């Protein structure tokens, strides 16, 4: 699924993501735009053999199992294939663990370089 800006905000807000670990809702829509272009099915191969999956591009090295990332962890306890669903439940619950893990939203390279220190509220502007 390719999500609208307002449509994704309402879904992230309903799955409790709004102000999670002090990160306002704008930081999260910001990250999804530049990680996936709001596309749940996005995949990107990394040079180490791991792959990033879904709207927040969650990495197979630590967080889920795609059966081709040798001696890797599955700390979400999910197949990576579940992170590609039109339903963002899996991606949100998985993200709650990552952003809690010590490094906050810096774990997302596109948030750090394109959202951190910007007017992030702009990303939910006009939505009900
Ligand atoms: C809502 C409208 O803006 C729709 N929009 C009309 C055309 N816009 C004109 C403008 O944005 O004033 C210029 C192109 N636009 C640039 C950008 O927005 O970054 C990219 C395409 N957009 C992406 C999006 O908006 O989600 C969809 C089409
Ligand atoms: C031409 C306009 O599109 C200018 N635009 C600024 C104003 N936009 C307009 C809007 O999207 O209605 C509102 C904020 N916008 C939200 C979003 O687009 O997702 C994020 C910033 N954008 C990023 C981008 O466009 O890729 C910068 C360019
Ligand atoms: Cl915000
Ligand atoms: Cl594996
Ligand atoms: Cl933090
Ligand atoms: Gd924009
Ligand atoms: Na893994």
Swiss-Prot record:
Pfam family for this entry, one: Lys
An example Gene Ontology biological process: cell wall macromolecule catabolic process
Additional comment: Lysozyme C is capable of both hydrolysis and transglycosylation; it also shows a slight esterase activity. It acts rapidly on both peptide-substituted and unsubstituted peptidoglycan, and slowly on chitin oligosaccharides.
EC number(s) given by UniProt: 3.2.1.17
Uppermost EC category: hydrolase
Localization per record: Secreted
InterPro entries with a match to the protein in the record: Glyco_hydro_22, Glyco_hydro_22_CS, Glyco_hydro_22_lys, Lysozyme-like_dom_sf
Domain C-type lysozyme: 1-128
Binding residue positions for substrate: 101
Protein's name according to its UniProt entry: Lysozyme C
PANTHER family, per the entry: LYSOZYME C
Family recorded in the similarity comment: Belongs to the glycosyl hydrolase 22 family.
Function: Lysozymes have primarily a bacteriolytic function; those in tissues and body fluids are associated with the monocyte-macrophage system and enhance the activity of immunoagents. Has bacteriolytic activity against M.luteus.
GO cellular component, one term: cytoplasm
GO molecular function terms noted in the UniProt entry: beta-N-acetylglucosaminidase activity; identical protein binding; lysozyme activity
Entries under PROSITE patterns matching the protein: GLYCOSYL_HYDROL_F22_1, GLYCOSYL_HYDROL_F22_2
Catalytic residue list: 35, 52
Chief location: secreted
Organ and tissue specificity: In the egg white and polymorphonuclear leukocytes.
Quaternary structure annotation from Swiss-Prot or TrEMBL: Monomer.
Keyword annotations: Allergen, Antimicrobial, Bacteriolytic enzyme, Disulfide bond, Glycosidase, Hydrolase, Secreted, Signal
Designated gene of the protein: LYZ
SS bond list: 6-127, 30-115, 64-80, 76-94
Catalytic activity: Hydrolysis of (1->4)-beta-linkages between N-acetylmuramic acid and N-acetyl-D-glucosamine residues in a peptidoglycan and between N-acetyl-D-glucosamine residues in chitodextrins
């Amino acid at each position: 699924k390719v999500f609208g800006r307002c449509e994704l905000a309402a879904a992230m807000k309903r799955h409790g993501l709004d102000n999670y670990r002090g990160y306002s809702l704008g930081n999260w829509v910001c990250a999804a735009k530049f990680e996936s272009n709001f596309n749940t099915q996005a995949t990107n191969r990394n040079t180490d053999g791991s792959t990033d999956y879904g709207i927040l591009q969650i990495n197979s090295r630590w967080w889920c199992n795609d059966g081709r990332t040798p001696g890797s962890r599955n700390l979400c306890n999910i197949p990576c294939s579940a992170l590609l669903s039109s339903d963002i439940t899996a991606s949100v619950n998985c993200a709650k663990k990552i952003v809690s893990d010590g490094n906050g939203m810096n774990a997302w390279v596109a948030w750090r370089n394109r959202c951190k220190g910007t007017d992030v509220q702009a990303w939910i502007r006009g939505c009900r």
